[PDB]
Amino acid sequence: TSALHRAADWAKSVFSSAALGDPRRTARLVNVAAQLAKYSGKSITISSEGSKAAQEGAYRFIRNPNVSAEAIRKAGAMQTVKLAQEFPELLAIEDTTSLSYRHQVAEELGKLGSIQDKSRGWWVHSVLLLEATTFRTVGLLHQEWWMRPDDPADADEKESGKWLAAAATSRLRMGSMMSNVIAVCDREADIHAYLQDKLAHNERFVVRSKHPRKDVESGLYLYDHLKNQPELGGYQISIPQKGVVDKRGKRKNRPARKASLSLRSGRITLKQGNITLNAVLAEEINPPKGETPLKWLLLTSEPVESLAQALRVIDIYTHRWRIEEFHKAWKTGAGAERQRMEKPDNLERMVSILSFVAVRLLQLRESFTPVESQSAETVLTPDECQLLGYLDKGKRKRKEKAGSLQWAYMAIARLGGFMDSKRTGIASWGALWEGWEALQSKLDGFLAAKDLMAQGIKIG
Amino acid sequence: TSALHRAADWAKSVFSSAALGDPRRTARLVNVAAQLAKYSGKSITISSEGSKAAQEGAYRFIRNPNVSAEAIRKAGAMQTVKLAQEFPELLAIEDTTSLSYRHQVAEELGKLGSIQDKSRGWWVHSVLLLEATTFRTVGLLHQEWWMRPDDPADADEKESGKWLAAAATSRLRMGSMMSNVIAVCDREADIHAYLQDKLAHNERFVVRSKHPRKDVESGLYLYDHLKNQPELGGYQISIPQKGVVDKRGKRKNRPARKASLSLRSGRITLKQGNITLNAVLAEEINPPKGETPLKWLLLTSEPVESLAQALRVIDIYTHRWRIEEFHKAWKTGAGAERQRMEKPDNLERMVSILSFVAVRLLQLRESFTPVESQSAETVLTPDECQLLGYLDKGKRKRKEKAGSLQWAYMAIARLGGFMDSKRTGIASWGALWEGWEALQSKLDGFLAAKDLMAQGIKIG
DNA sequence: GACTTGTGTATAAGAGTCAG
DNA sequence: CTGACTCTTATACACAAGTC
DNA sequence: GACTTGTGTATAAGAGTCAG
DNA sequence: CTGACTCTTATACACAAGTC
Ligand SMILES: [Mn+2]
Ligand SMILES: [Mn+2]
Ligand SMILES: [Mn+2]
Ligand SMILES: [Mn+2]
Ligand SMILES: [Mn+2]
Ligand SMILES: [Mn+2]
């Protein structure tokens, strides 16, 4: 959590114990990851800082047949495990994304849409660890990459196995820490076999309900049984404004709105397998006439008896969206789909390194995040703090304490172009990255002047 | 040509005499163009440097119903005319591009492809001025914007009129300088009416031949008449390697190759209108068995009698491609098609300003271009020169004179990620821009340190 | 000298993106 | 998904600065 | 101790992009 | 269009640095 800001130190902490069969391969991996992270989002060539040696080293590495992509990912994951020791409770957000390509190599990749689709690639199923107290991103725990064959019949295994395979790997890598982990998954994980496996291992989860299932004790579908349960209390949410574009391409507004939800919970036993677990039902009270009511039914191992316990389950699930944020940081952010390697294994090795660069992008912003009155020196070097103060002169908002962490956040965000168009105070990880990059880049000039003046040389 | 590097000075020189009906509108235009150029390629918000006032000013300007887009373009064009006074010969490259949009506003824009196409926008016909001695970009002379109607029958004028309309505007704005101007156009301008208009005005041109035409004196098609003309001599070209993707999407290599061409010329008289002009025919000698022979037939006002005169015509025409380079600098570079204004006039005003930002991108690189031994101080401030020397330390190639212009070019290009993958020594305008932006950004830190140390303040 | 338009501030929100 | 943002357009008010 | 793999240098070029 | 580039993969050689 501390090795983060300096790219070389971050890379070392993430990758230095990679088992690639040659310590030179491991050292090169550390260096490649370092230059990529320093120039997050940018090409291998740009990241080489004019060094032909570093450029050739980087390209040779990603096309190296003795370098296992799995072993790159595992090394990074074991670092996540290491950091996870610090926390009494963790959330393991789990979901699938695609990596889509259309250049020649696509021919050799797997199906994503139709058999006729030019866009081909991998499906990647990922587990992302958060600490469950303040929801900071701890890191990647697992990724399974596979290619979908054109003919379903040629598949070596069914794709619903992905949730169980992720659990098996999580279990194995976390060891005795697994009991601190709540897995969090959308409706696609609402699979009897998945629920059974988690409960069999005494493992913890919050999974959204998709299919109607009978409760043995009541003989009712979960929804109907939960509707009968006494109201625990309620909560209100603010759903913010956004544009929406649908599948065909039609555009409509979704205005901001308030919704009030009632909350209900209970212990349930699924007819199939006779397995027992908890459920929470959140349902909108008085939905507007022209809207579909909010409704979440969540299946969980967690306690749900009190209002506060049920609200915790609801809150845990609202953090599922972090993994989609990771997906964006991996693609738009780190450039997973901008890569143009010409062989599947080269692309895989490169894009596997970038999954870690992506996590850092999210953590970079979190390291600056706003009930305290911290100073900026806890996060920035004295030089960084001084230069930033120079750059932000006249821009500090009234509500920012002069040399505080909150000020530093806002000032770096301002360097990144943040203008707070919705007045929430929250800048995107992209804006924070841009600001951080701008500060670091300006710091090169700052320090160059400092160095020359230390040598006693006249400036300009 | 001198006001270029400092964005505020450049903007003033380009736009300060815009006739918009209120000097405040003109001042705002200067400021908007300045911030956009400083942050070339970047959004209005990023360009506002955290100033809410500048952001609101910029958005209000582009949606201002009292601001004519035509008057913005004219102002910039009159500056081109002004700079053109310095040169004894000019090339006026002329061509059309599209500006393509797919957001809501597209509905209100014109047809680009099929009636069913979601992509809609403007066609823009542009005249770009170069000086014909060293081929530096002088600036935009003319743009005609129009929307193609879904039904050809609703068109107020035929699109082939564009070449004549460009000539009429060029003529009008250049006045007596027109005689210094050679218009340069591809095969789409091979229109009798266009040739007649140029010759009627004693205007100069090099236009590639598309349609077979009879020569009166010989009774032959131009090609057959020119094939009979005595060989003037030849030349050899090196056609470089590139990938090619065709209309359907099929990929093939085009390997580098040498071609030898024979050169032939003559005076010709077109049967229709009885108009007299010159022609040059370049044709490949001994084409490889599996290739279509190189063949250019160019129609011109220029002398063609000697080998050197015909070679000059060929050379003039090889610079037509500059306008496509401008098109790229306007779209990919300056972000013409990244703009998301929600009304046609707003988009037009914004994208019209960006056409000038685009020209600057091309000129930025040209200002550093490599038979002399100049010093860097002719192009850079002493601070810029010192910082760059600090940044490039250890990267200077053997063939670069220590503090020269060539060194400065290469060093800024290296900051932009240039690694000379084809060993030509030529960096793209994009790489030079990136390097220049990086130098300027680092210069902020350099100068901040200089300022603090001048105030006697301890650094870090 | 009468009337309209721009600036800078605070506030609000529809449109668009990537993700899907 | 109750996403999480940035880009764009817009309003009132109190002056400043334009035009006719 | 015998054999294979990486590094850094010089050289070459196929693949891909935007433009079209 | 005889575009003008960047991204990617590749080769030889002379050592350095790995493995078995
Ligand atoms: Mn998902
Ligand atoms: Mn999903
Ligand atoms: Mn335990
Ligand atoms: Mn063209
Ligand atoms: Mn054309
Ligand atoms: Mn004259």
Question: How many contacts does A have with B, using Cβ atoms within 8 A?
Answer: 108
CB contact under 8 Å between B419 and A55, yes or no, is yes
Give the gap in angstroms from C-alpha B445 to the nearest C-alpha of chain A. Answer: 4
Ligand nearest to the CA of B84: 6
Q: Which of residues 301-360 of A touch strand D (CB under 7 A)?
A: 314, 318, 320-321, 324-325, 328
Backbone angles phi, psi at A40, to 5 degrees: -55, 135
Residue closest to A141 by CA, chosen among A165, A116, A119, A120:
A165
CB contact under 8 Å between A391 and B450, yes or no, is no
Radius of gyration of chain A measured on its C-alpha atoms: 24
Distance from residue B199's CA to the centre of ligand 6 (Å): 16
User: What are the distances in angstroms from CA A236 to CA A283, A285, A286, A294?
Assistant: 11, 10, 12, 11
Give the gap in angstroms from C-alpha B297 to the nearest C-alpha of chain A. Answer: 36
User: What are the distances in angstroms from CA A308 to CA A215, A234, A301?
Assistant: 24, 10, 15
Domains B1-67 and B68-343 share a fold: no
The stretches of B212-306 forming alpha helices (DSSP H) are: 222-228
User: What are the distances in angstroms from CA B433 to CA A109, B15, B150, B369?
Assistant: 36, 22, 39, 13
Task: Count CA atoms closer than 13 A to A292's CA, side-chain side.
Answer: 3
Q: Residue A350: which H helix or E strand, with range?
A: helix A344-366
Q: What is the dihedral of CA A390, A394, A400, A403, to 10 degrees?
A: 20
Q: Sign (positive/negative) of CA torsion B98, B99, B102, B108?
A: negative
* Candidates A39, A245, A421, A459, partner chain B, best to mutate (most B CBs within 10 A): A459
Using CA atoms, how far apart are residues B65 and B43, in angstroms rounded to an integer? 22
**Scanning the structure block, which residue is given the tokens 């072993």?**
A71
CATH for the stretch A344-451 = 1.10.740.10
CATH for the stretch B1-67 = 1.10.246.40
Q: Which of residues 205-224 of A touch strand D (CB under 7 A)?
A: 208
Helix (H/G/I), strand (E/B), else coil: B305: coil
Question: A287 and A293 in contact (C-beta within 8 Å)?
Answer: yes
Distance from residue B159's CA to the centre of ligand 5 (Å): 13
Give the bases of strand E that a protein CB approaches within 7 Å.
Answer: 5-20
Facing residue for A445 by CB, picked from B46, B414, B446: B446
Tokens read off for A106: 């696509």
CB contact under 8 Å between B448 and A452, yes or no, is no
Q: Please tell me if residue B19 touches chain A, with a CB cutoff of 8 Å.
A: no
Tokens read off for A437: 């990059």
CB contact under 8 Å between A460 and B382, yes or no, is yes
Domain boundaries, chain B: 1-67, 68-343, 344-451
Which residues of chain A make contact with B446, given a CB cutoff of 8 A? 445-446, 448-449, 459
Domain B68-343: CATH architecture, name and number where available: Alpha-Beta Complex (3.90)
Residue closest to A66 by CA, chosen among A356, A289, A349:
A349
- Using C1' positions and the CA of A57, the closest nucleotide is E7
* Buried-exposed string A413-429: b where 16+ CB fall within 10 A, e elsewhere: bbbbbbbeeeeeeebeb
Facing residue for A104 by CB, picked from B52, B251, B442: B251
CB contact under 8 Å between A445 and B450, yes or no, is no
* DSSP secondary structure code for residue A403 in this structure: T
**Chain A residue with minimum CA distance to B410:** A50
Q: Please tell me if residue B81 touches chain A, with a CB cutoff of 8 Å.
A: no
Strands (E), B150-271: 181-185, 204-208, 233-239, 242-245, 251-254, 257-270
Q: Which residues of B are annotated as a binding site for Mg(2+)?
A: 95, 186, 324
Measure CA to C1' and name the residue nearest D17. Answer: B24
DSSP assignment of B392-457 equals HTTT--TTS-TTBHHHHHHHHHHHTT---TTSS----HHHHHHHHHHHHHHHHHHHHHHHHHHTTP
Residue closest to A401 by CA, chosen among A390, A391, A411:
A411
Radius of gyration of chain B measured on its C-alpha atoms: 24
Residue type, A78: M
* DSSP secondary structure code for residue B148 in this structure: -
CB contact under 8 Å between B442 and A444, yes or no, is yes
Measure CA to C1' and name the residue nearest E8. Answer: A53
